[PDB]
Amino acid sequence: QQNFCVVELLPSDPEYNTVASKFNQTCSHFRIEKIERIQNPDLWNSYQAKKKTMDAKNGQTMNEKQLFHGTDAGSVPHVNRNGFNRGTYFAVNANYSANDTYSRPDANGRKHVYYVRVLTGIYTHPPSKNPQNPTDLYDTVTDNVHHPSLFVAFYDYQAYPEYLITFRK
Numbered sequence: 794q795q796n797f798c799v800v801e802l803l804p805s806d807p808e809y810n811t812v813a814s815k816f817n818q819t820c821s822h823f824r825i826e827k828i829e830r831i832q833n834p835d836l837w838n839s840y841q842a843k844k845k846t847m848d849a850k851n852g853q854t855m856n857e858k859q860l861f862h863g864t865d866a867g868s869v870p871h872v873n874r875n876g877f878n879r880g881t882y883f884a885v886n887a888n889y890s891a892n893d894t895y896s897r898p899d900a901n902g903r904k905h906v907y908y909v910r911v912l913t914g915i916y917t918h919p920p921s922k923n924p925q926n927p928t929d930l931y932d933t934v935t936d937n938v939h940h941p942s943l944f945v946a947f948y949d950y951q952a953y954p955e956y957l958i959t960f961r962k
């Protein structure tokens with residue numbers, strides 16, 4: 794259970810182009826080896842379930858964002874099956890996740906950054922909305938509320954690792 798499939802995208806595919814564009818906004822100086830869509834039905838269903846309840850709760854809020862997460866090659870099979878379970882940091886701009894401390898170059902100089910659907914929801918600088926009602930907390934935290942560059946999720950199934958980007962210098 795929570796099994797997955799890994800589908801490589803053709804650079805001639807609109808879906809590859811979409812992911813690449815966003816990546817190249819801050820990382821056009823890197824070369825992309827490949828992009829793969831991670832298909833994990835049970836992780837996706839858990840994520841959508843949490844999104845349904847979140848959309849019913851946060852009103853006019855656009856709860857979802859697409860953010861980056863750099864990681865070592867060793868971590869790929871874990872993320873693919875488990876998502877980002879047991880907080881976890883995500884970047885607005887790809888170049889931040891492209892730092893060698895997050896996405897280490899493997900033996901061949903290859904670097905790995907996920908492009909993640911994250912349920913950011915309502916967020917602040919896992920704290921509570923009202924200290925009088927400490928059961929209803931904030932969805933994520935960020936570094937800056939008006940000009941965010943990073944978000945941190947805590948609860949499971951709050952982030953779906955849709956695409957994997959393999960690239961090099």
Ligand SMILES: CN1CCC(CNc2nc3sc4c(c3c(=O)[nH]2)CCCC4)CC1
Pocket residue numbers: 861862863864865868882883884889890894895896942943
């Ligand atoms: C063995 N480990 C290798 C490292 C990996 C860390 N993953 C990761 N951490 C961070 S902290 C941070 C960002 C970020 C990220 O993208 N990935 C981006 C925005 C700025 C702040 C965990 C497993």
